[PDB]
Short mmCIF file of C-alpha atoms and ligand atoms in Angstrom, two decimals:
data_model
loop_
_atom_site.label_atom_id
_atom_site.label_comp_id
_atom_site.label_asym_id
_atom_site.label_seq_id
_atom_site.Cartn_x
_atom_site.Cartn_y
_atom_site.Cartn_z
CA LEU A 3 100.48 82.51 120.21
CA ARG A 4 100.19 81.14 116.68
CA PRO A 5 96.90 79.29 116.19
CA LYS A 6 96.73 77.29 112.97
CA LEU A 7 94.31 78.30 110.22
CA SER A 8 90.97 76.59 110.75
CA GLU A 9 89.64 74.36 107.97
CA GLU A 10 87.22 77.23 107.29
CA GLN A 11 89.96 79.86 107.03
CA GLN A 12 91.91 77.61 104.67
CA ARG A 13 88.80 77.36 102.53
CA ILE A 14 88.31 81.14 102.54
CA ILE A 15 91.89 81.59 101.29
CA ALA A 16 91.46 78.97 98.57
CA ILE A 17 88.19 80.58 97.46
CA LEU A 18 89.75 84.05 97.28
CA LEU A 19 92.82 82.84 95.38
CA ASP A 20 90.48 81.08 92.91
CA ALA A 21 88.28 84.18 92.58
CA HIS A 22 91.33 86.32 91.88
CA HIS A 23 92.76 83.86 89.33
CA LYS A 24 89.41 83.84 87.55
CA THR A 25 89.14 87.66 87.49
CA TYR A 26 92.68 88.93 87.03
CA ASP A 27 94.39 87.91 83.77
CA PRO A 28 98.13 88.29 84.37
CA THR A 29 98.81 88.45 80.64
CA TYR A 30 96.50 91.47 80.06
CA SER A 31 95.38 89.76 76.86
CA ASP A 32 92.06 91.63 76.66
CA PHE A 33 93.62 95.12 76.64
CA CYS A 34 93.91 95.36 72.85
CA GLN A 35 90.07 95.26 72.78
CA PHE A 36 89.85 98.60 74.53
CA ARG A 37 89.66 101.87 72.65
CA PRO A 38 93.25 102.57 71.66
CA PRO A 39 95.69 104.51 73.78
CA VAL A 40 96.63 107.86 72.19
CA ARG A 41 99.58 109.83 73.48
CA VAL A 42 99.74 113.47 72.37
CA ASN A 43 102.63 115.88 72.82
CA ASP A 44 102.39 117.34 76.33
CA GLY A 45 105.88 117.71 77.75
CA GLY A 46 104.64 120.81 79.53
CA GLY A 47 101.86 118.78 81.10
CA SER A 48 99.50 121.56 80.04
CA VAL A 49 96.19 121.32 81.87
CA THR A 50 94.44 123.26 79.09
CA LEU A 51 95.80 120.91 76.43
CA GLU A 52 95.12 117.80 78.53
CA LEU A 53 91.49 118.80 79.06
CA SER A 54 91.08 119.80 75.42
CA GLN A 55 92.24 116.38 74.19
CA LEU A 56 91.88 113.86 77.03
CA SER A 57 93.84 111.58 74.70
CA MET A 58 94.31 108.69 77.09
CA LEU A 59 90.83 108.88 78.61
CA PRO A 60 89.02 106.48 76.25
CA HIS A 61 91.62 103.78 76.81
CA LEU A 62 91.99 104.24 80.57
CA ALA A 63 88.21 104.53 81.02
CA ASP A 64 87.85 101.21 79.17
CA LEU A 65 90.60 99.71 81.34
CA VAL A 66 88.92 100.95 84.51
CA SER A 67 85.46 99.88 83.35
CA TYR A 68 86.77 96.39 82.51
CA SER A 69 88.45 96.31 85.90
CA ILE A 70 85.24 97.27 87.70
CA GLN A 71 83.50 94.34 85.97
CA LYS A 72 86.26 92.07 87.22
CA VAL A 73 86.01 93.47 90.77
CA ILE A 74 82.25 92.82 90.76
CA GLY A 75 82.97 89.19 89.84
CA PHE A 76 85.65 88.90 92.53
CA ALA A 77 83.38 90.44 95.18
CA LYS A 78 80.59 87.99 94.40
CA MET A 79 82.96 85.14 95.32
CA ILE A 80 84.03 86.58 98.70
CA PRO A 81 82.67 84.22 101.39
CA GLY A 82 79.65 85.89 102.91
CA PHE A 83 79.22 88.65 100.33
CA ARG A 84 76.14 87.04 98.81
CA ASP A 85 74.51 86.98 102.27
CA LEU A 86 74.25 90.78 102.12
CA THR A 87 71.21 92.44 100.53
CA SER A 88 71.70 93.55 96.92
CA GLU A 89 71.45 97.19 97.99
CA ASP A 90 74.31 96.72 100.45
CA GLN A 91 76.30 94.77 97.86
CA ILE A 92 75.99 97.63 95.39
CA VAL A 93 76.81 100.30 97.98
CA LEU A 94 79.99 98.40 98.86
CA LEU A 95 81.00 97.86 95.23
CA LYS A 96 80.46 101.45 94.16
CA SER A 97 82.35 102.87 97.09
CA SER A 98 85.30 100.47 96.93
CA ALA A 99 85.75 100.06 93.15
CA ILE A 100 88.48 102.64 92.67
CA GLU A 101 90.32 101.44 95.80
CA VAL A 102 90.26 97.84 94.66
CA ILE A 103 91.46 98.93 91.23
CA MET A 104 94.38 100.72 92.89
CA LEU A 105 95.17 97.63 94.99
CA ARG A 106 94.86 95.06 92.19
CA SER A 107 96.93 97.23 89.85
CA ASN A 108 99.90 96.73 92.16
CA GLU A 109 100.39 93.40 90.36
CA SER A 110 101.24 95.22 87.09
CA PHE A 111 103.06 98.08 88.81
CA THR A 112 106.82 97.75 88.67
CA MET A 113 109.52 99.60 90.57
CA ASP A 114 111.88 99.08 87.62
CA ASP A 115 110.55 102.36 86.15
CA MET A 116 107.53 103.22 88.33
CA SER A 117 104.95 102.30 85.68
CA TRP A 118 102.12 99.80 85.38
CA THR A 119 103.56 97.52 82.71
CA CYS A 120 100.88 95.46 80.92
CA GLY A 121 102.71 94.49 77.74
CA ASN A 122 104.53 96.30 74.97
CA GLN A 123 105.05 100.05 75.15
CA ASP A 124 101.43 100.57 74.06
CA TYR A 125 100.15 99.10 77.33
CA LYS A 126 102.78 100.51 79.66
CA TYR A 127 101.04 103.16 81.75
CA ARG A 128 103.09 105.96 83.24
CA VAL A 129 102.29 109.06 85.29
CA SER A 130 102.23 111.07 82.04
CA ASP A 131 99.41 108.83 80.78
CA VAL A 132 97.24 109.61 83.81
CA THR A 133 97.80 113.33 83.26
CA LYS A 134 96.68 112.75 79.64
CA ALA A 135 93.44 111.38 81.04
CA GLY A 136 92.84 114.64 82.88
CA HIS A 137 94.15 114.00 86.39
CA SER A 138 96.57 116.14 88.38
CA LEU A 139 99.57 115.51 90.58
CA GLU A 140 97.46 115.88 93.72
CA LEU A 141 96.21 112.38 92.87
CA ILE A 142 99.08 110.95 90.86
CA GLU A 143 101.95 111.55 93.28
CA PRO A 144 100.17 109.96 96.27
CA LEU A 145 99.04 107.13 94.00
CA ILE A 146 102.63 106.31 93.04
CA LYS A 147 103.79 106.59 96.67
CA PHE A 148 101.00 104.14 97.58
CA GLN A 149 102.05 101.70 94.84
CA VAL A 150 105.64 101.70 95.99
CA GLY A 151 104.76 101.32 99.66
CA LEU A 152 102.45 98.44 98.86
CA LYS A 153 104.98 96.79 96.57
CA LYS A 154 107.55 96.93 99.36
CA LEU A 155 105.33 95.00 101.78
CA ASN A 156 106.09 92.03 99.49
CA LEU A 157 102.68 90.53 100.14
CA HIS A 158 101.97 86.86 99.59
CA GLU A 159 99.16 86.43 97.09
CA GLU A 160 97.03 85.13 99.99
CA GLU A 161 97.55 88.44 101.83
CA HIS A 162 96.89 90.45 98.65
CA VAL A 163 93.54 88.80 97.97
CA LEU A 164 92.50 88.99 101.59
CA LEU A 165 93.31 92.73 101.57
CA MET A 166 91.13 93.33 98.52
CA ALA A 167 88.30 91.39 100.13
CA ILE A 168 88.61 93.34 103.39
CA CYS A 169 88.63 96.60 101.43
CA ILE A 170 85.33 95.68 99.72
CA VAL A 171 83.50 94.45 102.83
CA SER A 172 83.94 97.62 104.90
CA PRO A 173 81.10 98.46 107.28
CA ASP A 174 81.86 102.19 107.49
CA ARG A 175 80.94 103.09 103.91
CA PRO A 176 78.24 105.77 103.69
CA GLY A 177 74.85 104.31 102.79
CA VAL A 178 75.32 100.84 104.22
CA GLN A 179 72.28 99.39 105.95
CA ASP A 180 73.37 96.22 107.69
CA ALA A 181 76.69 97.41 109.08
CA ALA A 182 76.78 94.60 111.64
CA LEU A 183 76.53 91.80 109.08
CA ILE A 184 79.20 93.49 106.95
CA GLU A 185 81.47 93.81 109.99
CA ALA A 186 80.96 90.11 110.72
CA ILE A 187 81.99 89.17 107.18
CA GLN A 188 84.95 91.54 107.38
CA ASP A 189 86.03 90.25 110.79
CA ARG A 190 86.01 86.66 109.47
CA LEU A 191 88.35 87.86 106.69
CA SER A 192 90.53 89.96 109.06
CA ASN A 193 91.05 87.09 111.50
CA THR A 194 91.98 84.89 108.56
CA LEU A 195 94.57 87.46 107.47
CA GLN A 196 95.97 87.99 110.98
CA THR A 197 96.20 84.21 111.48
CA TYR A 198 97.82 83.72 108.09
CA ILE A 199 100.41 86.39 108.80
CA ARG A 200 101.41 85.06 112.24
CA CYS A 201 101.59 81.57 110.77
CA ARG A 202 102.87 81.64 107.20
CA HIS A 203 104.72 84.94 106.91
CA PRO A 204 108.50 84.53 107.45
CA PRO A 205 110.39 87.16 109.51
CA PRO A 206 111.18 89.99 109.54
CA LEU A 210 103.88 94.71 112.17
CA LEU A 211 102.67 93.60 108.74
CA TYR A 212 99.00 93.53 109.69
CA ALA A 213 99.04 97.09 110.97
CA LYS A 214 100.87 98.17 107.79
CA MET A 215 98.16 96.55 105.65
CA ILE A 216 95.43 98.26 107.67
CA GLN A 217 97.23 101.56 107.13
CA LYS A 218 97.13 100.98 103.36
CA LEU A 219 93.33 100.72 103.62
CA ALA A 220 93.29 104.16 105.27
CA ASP A 221 95.55 105.53 102.53
CA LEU A 222 93.09 104.15 99.99
CA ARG A 223 90.23 106.17 101.51
CA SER A 224 92.32 109.34 100.98
CA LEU A 225 93.07 108.38 97.37
CA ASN A 226 89.36 107.58 96.79
CA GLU A 227 88.37 111.04 98.04
CA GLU A 228 90.95 112.80 95.87
CA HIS A 229 89.94 110.71 92.85
CA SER A 230 86.27 111.64 93.41
CA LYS A 231 87.15 115.34 93.55
CA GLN A 232 89.08 115.11 90.29
CA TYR A 233 86.42 112.99 88.60
CA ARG A 234 83.84 115.70 89.41
CA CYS A 235 86.04 118.31 87.75
CA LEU A 236 86.67 116.09 84.75
CA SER A 237 82.91 115.57 84.36
CA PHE A 238 82.56 119.31 83.67
CA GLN A 239 84.58 118.98 80.50
CA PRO A 240 82.23 119.13 77.53
CA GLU A 241 81.88 115.76 75.78
CA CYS A 242 83.65 113.93 78.62
CA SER A 243 80.84 111.39 79.05
CA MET A 244 81.45 109.87 75.58
CA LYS A 245 85.04 109.17 76.58
CA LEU A 246 83.84 107.23 79.63
CA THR A 247 81.48 104.18 79.82
CA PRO A 248 78.01 103.67 81.37
CA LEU A 249 79.49 101.69 84.24
CA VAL A 250 82.18 104.31 84.98
CA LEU A 251 79.50 107.04 84.84
CA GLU A 252 77.33 105.20 87.34
CA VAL A 253 80.08 104.19 89.72
CA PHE A 254 81.69 107.63 89.94
CA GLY A 255 78.67 109.78 89.19
C1 KH1 B 1 93.35 99.05 86.28
C2 KH1 B 1 94.33 98.11 86.35
C3 KH1 B 1 95.69 98.38 85.83
C4 KH1 B 1 96.39 99.53 86.02
C5 KH1 B 1 96.01 100.67 86.85
C6 KH1 B 1 96.39 101.94 86.66
C7 KH1 B 1 97.26 102.43 85.55
C8 KH1 B 1 96.44 103.51 84.74
C9 KH1 B 1 95.89 104.64 85.57
C10 KH1 B 1 95.01 104.09 86.70
C11 KH1 B 1 93.73 103.40 86.10
C12 KH1 B 1 94.65 105.03 87.84
C13 KH1 B 1 93.59 106.11 87.54
C14 KH1 B 1 93.75 107.27 88.57
O1 KH1 B 1 93.87 106.57 86.24
C15 KH1 B 1 92.74 106.98 85.43
C16 KH1 B 1 91.56 107.39 86.30
C17 KH1 B 1 90.35 107.01 85.47
C18 KH1 B 1 89.14 107.93 85.54
O2 KH1 B 1 89.09 108.71 86.71
C19 KH1 B 1 87.92 107.03 85.56
C20 KH1 B 1 87.95 105.96 84.42
C21 KH1 B 1 89.05 108.96 84.44
C22 KH1 B 1 90.21 109.96 84.37
C23 KH1 B 1 94.25 104.08 89.04
C24 KH1 B 1 95.02 102.74 88.76
C25 KH1 B 1 95.88 103.03 87.51
C26 KH1 B 1 96.25 97.26 84.97
C27 KH1 B 1 96.11 95.86 85.57
O3 KH1 B 1 96.93 95.74 86.78
C28 KH1 B 1 94.66 95.61 85.91
C29 KH1 B 1 94.12 96.73 86.88
O4 KH1 B 1 92.75 96.47 87.18
#
């Protein structure tokens, strides 16, 4: 049974594609405005040295902070999001920010060399850059596995934006008040995605795979939170972050 997308579902897709195009610059032209990337000698991947310098933290914190601002803008355009109270909106944004960043970054991720390529060598981010920002393999390895698995689903941009929207409007986040309204908004998005898939996605299970990526994201979120807490213990770490990053992860 392949019901056609309703006029409403078509509108939801057009709105999400527009929101993404307005909030994700595929040329990465703003990145030179961030504090500059610095890459120190760390072939040994020394934790002591990485924590002592946190060379790539200013740049990656600025990239993440910028990305959170973009995610806030994207979320505000999701059909139904503005119906939620501001408190619920903020709870959802703070809890999903890192997950949406991991999802949206798949657009710059490339399997050519397993990096997030955003321009010249200066803005090519590799695993070694994340270690230079103070993170460990317990987060990085699973993150790369997630990027590759997501890349291989070969999602249509419609599916990609719907997945980000579904990730943000999740009723099971701790602290949510009106879970039922959030579930209604999410269900409207989920049905749109399921309909789109069994309608526009050429053969050769995709929906279940996408749902599984949302579960993987919860695991990555938890590991990232654990590592952020540890990083926050490093003296002077707050200056290398930004007020928005401090609030969202603090
Ligand atoms: C962001 C975006 C991009 C890349 C994402 C990356 C590469 C760098 C390392 C990141 C940011 C990972 C992250 C695990 O690295 C640094 C973690 C950052 C922090 O915990 C808080 C700032 C301090 C160490 C998650 C996603 C990774 C570029 C572009 O696709 C826009 C997108 O919007």
